[PDB]
Symmetry: C5
Subunit: 205 residues, 5 copies
């Protein structure tokens, strides 16, 4: 643990924290969802509650090290408070997200960071027709709140939401779940804006 | 990252933060609402729940910099905790406001700041008649809690609330939503608010 | 802003914080309520929820300055966290108070402070009869939790609760609302008893 | 305020805080409850909600001072964060306790500390029979969470819970309320068993 | 107090905190549940609420001391904030866990730590059948969120959940309750809490 202590000291106690990306030093954030449960549907308010894990990955030059200078350490876990993290937000939530997992990230020697917060989210969704064979489709966009595509580019590894951990005895069965990168422009501004649209079709089980 | 780290350090670590406006150095805050959803109505307590974005803009000389001294950086994003922000509050909420977005602001080299907190607000409103074609009208004022018109002047750019992102499948349809600056006098100095007036009905 | 910055540095950075009152340096806190709304009544638990603004005032010698020395600044606003505030507490709440306003106070050059927290409070109240013409009366005492009357005295400006901002379309109309200093029982403790008589509109 | 500022500096800014008791230097904590209200009964989940004040007392050598060296101050109020406090916990709560009073304690020159947290507690209790004349009995034990009786001994000044502040218009009438020290159970384990018998008013 | 004050200053004020385990200095965490109550089931959302206390034990060289040098102190209690603690997490909770006990641990001179957080947990569970004679079985896995079995191995002292403190007047009777270490393929380790229950 001596080497890791030195590593963290060198990484976090020497320079100011990473100030976030800029147009001149943009960052790509890879986003992916593992949907565990549609927990609740409220047809009186058109809110639906999801529980999922949101995988986030990005890479910082300032987080790199040579494993040889640090006892061959190739990666470590550290509190998310010690590092910059992206401001990925649901655009149509109706309550603050509830955090279901410890806020800890994995940093590897090439400056890659992997952060996977489990969340419960209430978001805008009319569940009308969920009690049918065809089900109902709802959607929520995720993106940076303050950074445009010139500072944070989003990508997905795949358009298929990971369902391998979906609760088999949920009240709701998933018919399809996709996660799609979308680009848009606003007339005021030349910079593109990026989101990942989470689209879930589901019905009562 | 180098130039930005220098900038933030120079801007934030060298002298005290802006201490807020005074009657002698007043500040103008521009407000604009984007109403997303009327999520719920409680006819038993006369509380209605809104989800909206609130755009806040102001400008401080203390946040100015010459981009040429900082690798041509012209703006940056930073935690709202690093800067002064105005204490704009709803005057008739019935619960603490729930924050729905990251508390991060955009600062521009001319001292301009743009901060856009997404919020869920429960406020006093009698939904009697919401189930009619004419619907119901409710209103909530927003303003500084502690600063008078002599220290913080409020304005809007338009009296139309932005509805272009209103949830099309909300339980409630919006008939009308305005955001209007008001000047009040109690019993010497003016007090300013922006009155959010929303008329709505069951969809 | 330059002068206000110097003032706050001089007041807050260059001294140890006020450790609160004592028998030898007692403090008098003036309290006033502005009742905005009786939101909710729960007849199954005898709890009632109030929304109000609670005006608190007191004065500290350590918060004084000479306006001449600071560009004629006569008062300023500052976060409540920068200053000592009194531990005025409801004695019969049933849930932690919810704060509805910024925690910022106004400090004046004579050392006076004005702090007006807006709050939602659930407190012990039996609403049986609220749906009658007579209505019902409930009361809740506010006072320091740990300071006796030898350290914190309490007063009101007047026993009349401010109803000029009471929500016109509340489910509940106010038949009356008073705020009265009381002395209760080693040492005397002081409270202000908020007594509200109300009924369904 | 100057002498008090000196005292607190001397008490809190010179040596590390009391590290808590050990088998060799045990500590006695006295507990008493003032039951304010049985607010809620949930017969679908067998949870009952109490509001009460819990008086806690203990004495530390490290909090002693000679009043003669500090302008004759004999006691002061200070944030509970400034001092060690015992980890007294209900053993059968079903929700985190909600704190209803400011986190401030009173320290006296002999090193005595008094801390009186007001709390709302949900705990395990089958209310069946509450709507009868016999009433129903529920109980919850309170004790240190991590300290055995070799480190913290608990004591009560009485086994009668203080009902002098019990809400007279509660939904529930108290038939009896006791607080009994119990020894279980290399070390001995000590708790105060709060036993309340009540019925619908 | 003086000796313990010295001990804690020496332990916590000199070096950086233990930075957590790695493949080359892996750590073993022992878990055990004491189930107190099945408080609530929600058949509309398939959510069940448990109240339990979760024993966690592990051992750090960095927490060792010679009792001879510290007034024969063999152990002490200290805020969990003062020490590293494992990130043991329920894998199928539906609300943030609520902590019911002080966050304080016992550290022993051999570096051993014992931490026993009491928790209320809402987790994914279909109670259909709970009012039947056969009752219903639900399960929830616990483990490290971010460390594999290469960094944190999990163990139990028994596969029987402690029911000796189960609430006698719960709405639910416990028919069985087990806690079983599972390895899935770095190996990934969890403890599967499995509870069969029915309405009293």
């Amino acid at each position: 643990q001596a080497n890791l202590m030195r590593l963290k000291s060198d990484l976090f106690n020497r320079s100011p924290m990473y100030p976030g990306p800029t147009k001149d030093d943009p960052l790509t954030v890879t986003l992916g969802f593992t949907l565990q449960d549609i927990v609740k549907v409220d047809s009186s308010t058109n809110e639906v509650d999801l529980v999922y894990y949101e995988q986030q990955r990005w890479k910082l030059n300032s987080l790199m090290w040579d494993p040889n200078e640090y006892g061959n350490i190739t990666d470590f876990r550290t509190s998310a408070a010690d590092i910059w993290t992206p401001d990925i937000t649901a655009y149509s939530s109706t309550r603050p997200v509830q955090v279901l997992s410890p806020q800890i990230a994995v940093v590897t020697h090439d400056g890659s960071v992997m952060f996977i917060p489990a969340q419960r989210l209430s978001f805008m969704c009319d569940p009308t027709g969920v009690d049918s064979e065809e089900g109902v489709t709802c959607a929520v966009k995720f993106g940076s709140w303050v950074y445009s595509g010139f500072e944070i580019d989003l990508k997905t590894d795949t358009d298929q939401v990971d369902l391998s951990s979906y609760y088999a005895s949920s009240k709701y069965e998933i018919l399809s779940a996709t996660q799609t990168r979308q680009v848009q422009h606003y007339s005021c501004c030349p910079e593109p804006y990026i989101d990942v649209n989470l689209v879930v079709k589901f019905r009562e089980r």
